[PDB]
Amino acid sequence: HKSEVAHRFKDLGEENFKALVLIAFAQYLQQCPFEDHVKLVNEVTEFAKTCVADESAENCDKSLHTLFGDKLCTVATLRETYGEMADCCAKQEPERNECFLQHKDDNPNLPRLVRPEVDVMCTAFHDNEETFLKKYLYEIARRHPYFYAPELLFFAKRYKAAFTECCQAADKAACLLPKLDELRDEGKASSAKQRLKCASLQKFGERAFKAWAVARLSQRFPKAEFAEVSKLVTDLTKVHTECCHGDLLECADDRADLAKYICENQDSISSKLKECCEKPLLEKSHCIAEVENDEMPADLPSLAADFVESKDVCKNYAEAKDVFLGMFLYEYARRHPDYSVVLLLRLAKTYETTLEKCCAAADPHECYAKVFDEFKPLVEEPQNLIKQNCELFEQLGEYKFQNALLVRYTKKVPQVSTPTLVEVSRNLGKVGSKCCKHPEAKRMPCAEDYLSVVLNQLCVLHEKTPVSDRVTKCCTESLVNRRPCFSALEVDETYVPKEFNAETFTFHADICTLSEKERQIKKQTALVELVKHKPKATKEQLKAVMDDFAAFVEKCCKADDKETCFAEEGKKLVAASQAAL
């Protein structure tokens, strides 16, 4: 291991090496032009090949942090452009690297990347495929400087595949656009999870993180024994703690180490791990992190033996409370992959609460019996919600299902901005489409995955621009009570109806040309504004108003003249509607 850079180049391969180096530099120097970074990438790459030919080369023996930091400090416009960051160059390793980490800018001021015309895109992709993909990789990287590089590289390769298909199919846009949208969604969903995962570690501490980890690791690896799960959870915590810190190389090494260990003890962890461990170093950790749940042992007893009916229960628990609780959590989770992780956490927490209560009683054995009865109401809470909502999603379209939620959440929290209500409602709708297609056995984990990001996304926007105490109570409580807290929201009896505005309910003929997506958005925007103006409207009354509107649109988008119909019958619709409500 004379040369760190030489070893990295051999493991990743020139192409991946280049791509990752571009991402790294793009994540630090986020305000330097693309051609600058390209020059860097080629300089580092050529040097690396020098080191590959001969590890004893002149600078080959240096550290990757040292080499990276030196390159950063050779940027001529560094001080001018980045000010303080240029001061880091006086610090010495390893203090320097930390200094660079400190002055990494999160979400700087840049204009939103606008998706160009399909013809233009495919044409660029054909003429210069490499400078086309890398330019966009650079653009994504600079705007998401804390996103894990190998993960950003993982999406890049998927983008490249998308164009390869569609850019030579007659109806390109019909192919490409629904693929780019999927990527956009997944990319931001992945990014959200990461910030969230890291934020929770900081917010609630290592313990809660370990509890979360124990549940999911037990679910995924139900054939694994607790001692093994403990070591994995222990290491996973170590990894998340370092990765959350932000050092790419340190984070990468810890990840690689865990994947290394997991793949070598495959037989002792999971049977569905063979293909993941076969993949290259770069993809190992990724693969393991979302591997399929292993199938659990047929001969599995009930927990009641070791956790309820047994003697030595307070003694075993008091001897190591968190260990014993983790065992309960492990034992329970591996039997129920059909549960959300947070559900298992409510149960383990419930088990904990009673032991703290009953072990202090004269005879604990009775208060244990109470425990499992308490589990059932907590378990059915999320189960019922899923049944009903997926039924609702079945009867009504995804669009009409979104509108159902729309009215519901507008009446629960009317103070929220209209655009926010429309967005969260459309997204919860999408969750319905994706999860309700699963059977019950897999529905709850599915919902938890999407609601987690949607609910924390929701809480982030509220952080910046608070609008309700009840929403801030939900956003700032335990991430296990979060979703139930939102579900506990009732209709706001406080809300004063917002004053009428004819403009808000004034529609022109342009909506007849609008795309299917934003005709809906404009309609849904008005639906929120309707519910806000008269929040005490019944479902029948609201349906009536919406029906008249719907026919009103089809009557004006069907006429020889249009803009007059929208202004004349529009006047009629608004008047009649104000009267009914």
Q: Give whichever of 283 and 563 is closer to ligand PLM, judged by the CB atom.
A: 283
Q: Give whichever of 179 and 272 is closer to ligand PLM, judged by the CB atom.
A: 179
Q: Which of residues 312-351 bind ligand PLM (CB under 6 A)?
A: 322-323, 325-326, 329, 340, 342-343, 345, 348-349
Q: Which two tokens stand for residue 382?
A: 């999320």
Give, as one character, the DSSP assignment of residue 505. Answer: G
Annotate 380-425 with DSSP letters as a single string. HHHHHHHHHHHHHHHHS-HHHHHHHHHHHHHHH-TTS-HHHHHHHH
Q: Which of residues 32-91 bind ligand PLM (CB under 6 A)?
A: 44, 64, 67-68
Min. distance of Cβ 359 from ligand PLM in angstroms?
15
Cβ contacts of 294 within 8 Å, gap of 6 or more: 220, 221, 222, 223, 270, 271, 272
Cβ pair 344, 222 in contact under 8 A: no
Site for ligand PLM contains 8 (CB under 6 A): yes
Cβ pair 138, 130 in contact under 8 A: no
Min. distance of Cβ 11 from ligand PLM in angstroms?
7
Binding-site annotation, residues for (4Z,15Z)-bilirubin IXalpha: 238
57, 73, 86, 140: which one contacts ligand PLM (CB under 6 A)?
140
Min. distance of Cβ 298 from ligand PLM in angstroms?
25
The continuous run of DSSP H or E covering 536 comes out as none
Q: Which of residues 467-526 bind ligand PLM (CB under 6 A)?
A: 467, 471, 478, 483, 486-487, 505, 523, 526
Residue that is written with structure tokens 């969260």 in the block: 424
Q: Give whichever of 166 and 348 is closer to ligand PLM, judged by the CB atom.
A: 348
32, 75, 78, 428: which one contacts ligand PLM (CB under 6 A)?
428
**Distance from C-alpha of 135 to C-alpha of 65, rounded to nearest angstrom:** 25
- Segment interacting with ligand PLM, rule: CB under 6 A, options 93-101, 252-260, 266-274, 354-362: 252-260
29, 32, 198, 248: which one contacts ligand PLM (CB under 6 A)?
248
Annotate 240-295 with DSSP letters as a single string. HHHHHHT-HHHHHHHHHHHHHHHHHTGGGT-STTHHHHHS-HHHHHHHHHTPPPPP
Q: Which of residues 188-217 bind ligand PLM (CB under 6 A)?
A: 204, 207-208, 210-211, 214
**Distance from C-alpha of 196 to C-alpha of 86, rounded to nearest angstrom:** 31
389, 418, 456, 457: which one contacts ligand PLM (CB under 6 A)?
389
Min. distance of Cβ 102 from ligand PLM in angstroms?
18
232, 303, 427, 448: which one contacts ligand PLM (CB under 6 A)?
448
- Among 494, 502, 516, smallest CA distance to 412 is for 494
Residue that is written with structure tokens 């983790």 in the block: 326
Residue that is written with structure tokens 């569905």 in the block: 272
Using CB under 6 A as the binding criterion, the count of chain residues that bind ligand PLM stands at 92
Q: Which of residues 519-578 bind ligand PLM (CB under 6 A)?
A: 523, 526-527, 530, 533, 545-546, 549-550, 573-574, 577-578
Neighbours of 562 (CB within 10 A): 15
- Segment interacting with ligand PLM, rule: CB under 6 A, options 80-88, 237-245, 264-272, 279-287: 279-287
Q: Give whichever of 38 and 467 is closer to ligand PLM, judged by the CB atom.
A: 467
52, 236, 435, 453: which one contacts ligand PLM (CB under 6 A)?
435
Min. distance of Cβ 54 from ligand PLM in angstroms?
17
**Distance from C-alpha of 330 to C-alpha of 325, rounded to nearest angstrom:** 8
Site for ligand PLM contains 115 (CB under 6 A): yes
Q: Give whichever of 118 and 294 is closer to ligand PLM, judged by the CB atom.
A: 118
Phi-psi category of residue 491: left, alpha or beta, with phi > 0 → left and psi -120 to 50 → alpha: beta
- For 302, 366, 475, the CA distances from 354, given in Å and listed in that order, are 19, 11, 27
Phi-psi category of residue 296: left, alpha or beta, with phi > 0 → left and psi -120 to 50 → alpha: beta
180, 288, 453, 531: which one contacts ligand PLM (CB under 6 A)?
180
